[PDB]
From TrEMBL, chain B:
Boundaries of the shown chain within the full protein: 143 to 324 of 327
Protein name per its UniProtKB record: Vinculin
Organism: Homo sapiens
Keyword Repeat: yes
One GO MF term: actin filament binding
Family stated for the protein in its record: Belongs to the vinculin/alpha-catenin family.
Main localization of the protein described in the UniProt heading: other
Keywords, alphabetical: Actin-binding, Cell adhesion, Cell junction, Cell membrane, Cytoplasm, Cytoskeleton, Membrane, Repeat
Cellular location(s): Cell junction, Adherens junction; Cell membrane, Sarcolemma; Cell projection, Podosome; Cytoplasm, Cytoskeleton
């Protein structure tokens, strides 16, 4: 992995993560008209404008984040017909996390995968800061929430190469470049019936120790050929996965991938159990 | 247009006022504004009354805002009254023409009081050097004034529509009453 490629990747991901060009204006006069909002934002390129007249708010999509920022700075706390406006970035609507991707899937293949469901607002794989390699998950945000529903639905359980994808909504809880990095991992390819959480969890401590670690027990109350782990930092998970993946244990070589960032061990485990459940 | 969503946390608003707004909204909503300025103006009043129900709960920039809000509503009611008297003028039914004139010769008064009251409440917004009882009473005068105004205009809508079917032949002024449904 070159360092000019690593940097270009990480760079693209940032441009994407930060192209937040959707703003919210609250405090508008009850009788505000769209013409009024369009006028107010005439120095900007409006891609979309919807005024909730009953709320005195306007949901506006500008050309890009740079314009969003300029609208926010320029009009937040300004006055329109004696009213004080609050201008700020819209909240997260249709933000999905597609995980368990093939570790080799490119950023372009990812866009291709996720783009049909509607127009994308932001789309980025998540790579390791050091290696520059995909962490096996990405994020897709659509212009419409409808689009995210379609996507989750068509992508949860989708086979992509040797993998079965997992999808998970960001409600959204708000992320930072820090939260983009997962603290949880999934171990599968476990031996048939295998029951060494003690051994399995022992194995997984060879670098850092799991704050969480459990087997996938069904409500049958079967055993689902996998396990979920958590680590104190995204960095501790990172190193753990790097060392653990491929390892022999039982008669088999374990596969070790990241879980979508967000949920803690407890939740991911159920989540994954229930997802694979709907078989 | 659009229905009025329900309540929540939330939603700091003054409920009786949002209710009054909602009552007007629901009446006007059923109708097209095309060819009907009373309906157009009523819709603006209800949305403005909704904003008022927030402003009155205090906050950043609410004083200037709340005063203008009352002014905006006052201006809109003038149109409703003005237009509602033209209708009464062209109507041949004494009962309706009479309810119509009555239910609307009070509007301008309620409106003026609204400005006066909004302004009082506006001056109180923030100042903690104002008795709780003086502000609460200010709020109450305003809520009650808002209710009359919302009701009065809702009745003007209903009577105007009634008169539409009791207008003189070859009238010089008419309002269009066409549903905005299915």
């Amino acid at each position: 992995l070159d360092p000019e490629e690593i940097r270009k990747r990480l760079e693209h991901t940032e441009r994407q993560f930060r192209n937040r060009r959707k703003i919210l204006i609250r405090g508008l006069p009850g009788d505000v008209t769209n013409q009024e909002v369009h006028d107010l934002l005439s120095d900007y390129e409006l891609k979309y404008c919807f005024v909730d007249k009953y709320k005195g708010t306007a949901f506006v999509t500008l050309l890009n984040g740079e314009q969003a920022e300029a609208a926010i700075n320029a009009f937040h706390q300004s006055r329109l017909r004696e009213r004080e406006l609050s201008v700020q970035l819209q909240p997260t609507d249709a933000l999905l996390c597609v995980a368990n991707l093939p570790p080799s899937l490119t950023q372009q293949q990812f866009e291709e995968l996720v783009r049909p469901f509607g127009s994308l607002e932001r789309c980025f794989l998540v790579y390791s800061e050091r290696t520059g390699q995909s962490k096996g998950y990405g994020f897709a945000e659509y212009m419409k929430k409808d689009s995210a529903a379609r996507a989750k639905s068509d992508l949860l359980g989708k086979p992509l190469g040797p993998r079965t994808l997992y999808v998970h909504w960001t409600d959204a809880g708000q992320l930072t470049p820090a939260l983009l990095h997962s603290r949880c991992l999934c171990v599968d390819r476990l031996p048939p019936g295998f029951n060494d959480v003690d051994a399995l969890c022992r194995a997984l401590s060879a670098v850092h120790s799991p704050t969480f670690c459990q087997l996938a027990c069904g409500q049958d109350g079967q055993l689902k050929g996998f396990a979920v782990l958590e680590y104190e930092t995204a960095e501790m998970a990172e190193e753990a996965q790097q060392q653990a993946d491929g390892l022999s244990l039982g008669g088999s070589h374990l596969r070790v991938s990241f879980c979508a960032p967000g949920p803690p061990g407890r939740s991911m485990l159920a989540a994954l159990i229930a997802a694979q459940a709907t078989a | 247009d659009e229905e009025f969503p329900e309540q929540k946390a939330g939603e700091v608003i003054n409920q009786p006022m949002m209710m009054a707004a909602r009552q007007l909204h629901d009446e006007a909503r059923k109708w097209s504004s095309k060819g009907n300025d009373i309906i157009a103006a009523a819709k603006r009043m209800a949305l403005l009354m909704a904003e008022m129900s927030r402003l009155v709960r205090g906050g950043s920039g609410t004083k200037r805002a709340l005063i203008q809000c009352a002014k905006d509503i006052a201006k809109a009611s003038d149109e409703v009254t003005r237009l509602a008297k033209e209708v009464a003028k062209q109507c041949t039914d004494k009962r309706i023409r009479t309810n119509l004139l009555q239910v609307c010769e009070r509007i301008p008064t309620i409106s003026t009081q609204l400005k006066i009251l909004s302004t009082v409440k506006a001056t109180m917004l923030g100042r903690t050097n104002i008795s709780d009882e003086e502000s609460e009473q200010a709020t109450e005068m305003l809520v009650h004034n808002a209710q009359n105004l919302m009701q009065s205009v809702k009745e003007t809508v209903r009577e105007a529509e009634a008169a539409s079917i009791k207008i003189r032949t070859d009238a010089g002024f008419t309002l269009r009453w066409v549903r905005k449904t299915p």
